[PDB]
Design a protein around this ligand. Sequence first.
Ligand SMILES: Oc1ccccc1CNc1nc2ccccc2[nH]1
Ligand SMILES: Oc1ccccc1CNc1nc2ccccc2[nH]1
Lengths: 304, 304
Amino acid sequence: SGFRKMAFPSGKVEGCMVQVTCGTTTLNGLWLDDVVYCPRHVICTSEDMLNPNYEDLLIRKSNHNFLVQAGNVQLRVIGHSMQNCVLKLKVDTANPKTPKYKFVRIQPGQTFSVLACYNGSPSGVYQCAMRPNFTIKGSFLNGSCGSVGFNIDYDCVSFCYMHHMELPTGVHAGTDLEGNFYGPFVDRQTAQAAGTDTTITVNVLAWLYAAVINGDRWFLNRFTTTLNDFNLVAMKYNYEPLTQDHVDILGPLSAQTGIAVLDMCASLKELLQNGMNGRTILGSALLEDEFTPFDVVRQCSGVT
Amino acid sequence: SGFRKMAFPSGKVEGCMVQVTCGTTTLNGLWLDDVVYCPRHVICTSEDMLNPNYEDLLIRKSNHNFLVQAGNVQLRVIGHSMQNCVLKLKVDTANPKTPKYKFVRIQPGQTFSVLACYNGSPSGVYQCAMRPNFTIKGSFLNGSCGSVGFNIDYDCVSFCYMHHMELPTGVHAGTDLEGNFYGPFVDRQTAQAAGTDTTITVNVLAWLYAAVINGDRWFLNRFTTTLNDFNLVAMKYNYEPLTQDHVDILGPLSAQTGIAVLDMCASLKELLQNGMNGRTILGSALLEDEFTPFDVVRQCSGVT
Ligand SMILES: Oc1ccccc1CNc1nc2ccccc2[nH]1
Ligand SMILES: Oc1ccccc1CNc1nc2ccccc2[nH]1
């Protein structure tokens, strides 16, 4: 029993983190097979960052300009290419600790673990969601760029995120491992405002199920609703719309608890309209939206 | 910028987790050097758990009765002893992945990372505090016993917790790595009630400093207080007393933010008396007490 914001064990990713230096810029790289992936802005002076032309900046760079260090041993760079907003540095040594891995582009509402790194050295691990505005609310100081987000399926690491940017509002933007930004963000020190950070409705419902499973039941009401009625209320409160795909996904939690999804929707509706009245659910005074239904099932079942 | 509940990278501890089986009971063990540490209740039938005599139960056990598996390879047990509420199983192989380590007994309010394990396999990592009532609020299913809590100082893992028990209220109890329970709990399926789960005042203050550092300043008031005045209010709200040792410990956060500790106390006092009025601090609707001052400095500075 008990329910925690839980990251994947980070060991498999710890074994992939290296330091990348280009001139005076140091950040982190991900070493898989004989390729090191890092944010292309490693080649910029903070001066360059205001309106960088990366193709033109890259012409001035050689393999020997990229200094790649794995522990306290240097890797030999034998090639470099730009793919979207990441650099791929070919090194002469396959990472001996390369895990089984995939590159995946996640959808808004999907959760993942971040291994926060500085100078290629892991500092911490936390759980995130891709926000509906394609930002994440991370913890990232200078030097944390190239830190990655991942899910693990038994022994296969799915890399979904590389850290590139902090927006002027102190939220975070980055790319998948093909170098494509989540949302409309660009690796340039310019005015970039995020859209509405809506609540991930399907995730709140999952977490309400987690609460029932763990004995927190005070919020369970006598009402039901319809998708359309619930969705009217969701919009008013800056909650993402709930689809039938979300209802289907919650099916196993519905089954385990014997609470129909639309009943749990009507409980959520009353919590939106009435608030928590100073009460807590799973030790939170607000509705948590950074657990997926899959996360709740994993943690409530005990997958390794 | 940004502030997350952050666990230590778990790789060094992942490399120490094994499966321990005695008869039909499977749980986790910690393999350091040529010793495997596990909860002594591995020797009990759930029937034994009602009033176990562990010395008498252990007489009926041999080295060959303890099945220790590290990945899918069996370790040979060449000795076993009981130290308090843990078993130490001497195996014929030193763990090749043993990190530098210490055993430390933490104080209430101290935070640590838990690597939740099932059948010797890591499932997740989260950050905890030892509660003032010597419980922890974990996430632990059947088979999670022998999962450990740790801090890391660069390359040295300090093991502070091994998981043994869930109380009938679904909070968690366990031992240090010398087998001594935190608080008054015993490894017996009997009536064990926790005392008052008070809020860790010094930790809330640290987190209020973290909030100021990260731009959340709305709660900063025009008042100050004294330790004695603040402490009267703390007691009324089930907050731990604040000592001069706590004020001294917050000194560096006081310095960084230019907010005197007693000023931040007076801000906390107003939040206790007035509540949050539907506002959030670092995305929480309640006051977080599971960051130490050391945690706030680490995450705000970027230690690896
Ligand atoms: O639903 C809302 C409630 C309040 C504010 C903003 C929104 C828009 N949310 C939204 N989710 C989407 C998913 C796919 C495509 C477009 C989407 N727009
Ligand atoms: O302060 C309180 C406010 C409300 C309820 C309970 C308490 C007691 N808290 C407490 N912390 C201690 C630390 C060391 C020794 C004894 C201690 N008692």
